[PDB]
Paper text:
The unusual crystals that grew in Tris-HCl at pH 8.8 diffracted to 1.7 Å resolution. These data were solved in space group P212121 with an asymmetric unit comprising one Pent. Despite the presence of 2 mM sclx8 during crystallization, there was no calixarene in this structure. This result can be interpreted in light of the crystallization pH, which is almost one unit above the calculated pI of Pent. Under these conditions, calixarene complexation is apparently switched off as the protein is anionic. This structure is further interesting as the crystal packing interfaces are distinct to those found in the Pent–sclx8 forms I and II. Furthermore, intramolecular noncovalent bonds such as the Lys5-Trp48 salt bridge are preserved in the Pent-only structure.
Residue numbers in the entry:
A (entry chain E), B (entry chain B), C (entry chain A), D (entry chain C), E (entry chain D): 2 to 48
Amino acid sequence: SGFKFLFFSPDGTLYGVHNDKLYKGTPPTSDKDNWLARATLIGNGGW
Amino acid sequence: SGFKFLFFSPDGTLYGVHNDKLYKGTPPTSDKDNWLARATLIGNGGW
Amino acid sequence: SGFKFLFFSPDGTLYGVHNDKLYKGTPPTSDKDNWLARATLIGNGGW
Amino acid sequence: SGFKFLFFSPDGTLYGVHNDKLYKGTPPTSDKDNWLARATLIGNGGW
Amino acid sequence: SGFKFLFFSPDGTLYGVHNDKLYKGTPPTSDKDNWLARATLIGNGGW
Ligand SMILES: CC(=O)N[C@@H]1[C@@H](O)[C@H](O)[C@@H](CO)O[C@@H]1O
Ligand SMILES: CC(=O)N[C@@H]1[C@@H](O)[C@H](O)[C@@H](CO)O[C@@H]1O
Ligand SMILES: CC(=O)N[C@@H]1[C@@H](O)[C@H](O)[C@@H](CO)O[C@@H]1O
Ligand SMILES: CC(=O)N[C@@H]1[C@@H](O)[C@H](O)[C@@H](CO)O[C@@H]1O
Ligand SMILES: CC(=O)N[C@@H]1[C@@H](O)[C@H](O)[C@@H](CO)O[C@@H]1O
């Protein structure tokens, strides 16, 4: 399923909508980085 | 049904299309922030 | 119908694909702004 | 006849995926500009 | 199915989601460029 939206802010922060929730964080630089687990949850639903 | 589009302008304003309407505003400050309730309505339909 | 694509250029111009046509213009600032009626048509189809 | 992706690079170049091919070029400035006929094909398949 | 997302970071790095994996790299230079073969894998699943 994965993300519904996945996009950058002009400040370089990666944003994503995943299971109707909004997340942000620095983009991963390696495939061992569990991005979703460490991303900042900034929206609990509705996205 | 969530958003149809969700994207940034170059100055870091978040834009979104929700129920055919267009909204803009600073991005959510936390998961406590009801963005859609405070976003500026900039289009009533047709998006 | 609504837009198929709706996105910004780095100079802050809003671009949209609507009914296979490509449009650009300054983003709307209020819900009184009929954006599609004033946007510059820059592609008459195929988008 | 219908793009899959259509988006800007931060350097102002328009990118588009059309039928599994990737194209780039300066954005069109009028509806007389046949963009896809003059765009640089930078990817042939897999997009 | 090709890519699910395909988008730029603000410094001009191309990001893409392909078969649930996240890749980044300089954008394709020409159709001689096998982008997916040389892109950096930065996320293995979940995208
Ligand atoms: C699209 C939108 O604004 N969603 C928000 C959600 O992110 C936030 O967690 C909640 C707090 O009450 O309010 C809204 O539902
Ligand atoms: C896509 C578009 O330009 N929609 C606008 C809408 O946002 C605005 O509220 C209305 C004002 O009359 O005109 C148009 O319908
Ligand atoms: C996808 C694309 O390049 N479409 C263009 C269209 O925008 C333009 O109005 C027309 C002019 O002849 O040529 C092409 O159809
Ligand atoms: C998604 C991707 O990297 N596609 C490329 C394609 O654009 C390029 O023309 C071809 C060259 O052999 O290699 C790959 O298929
Ligand atoms: C959406 C997300 O954060 N996916 C990551 C994936 O990129 C990474 O390869 C994996 C490491 O085990 O962790 C998570 O699955």
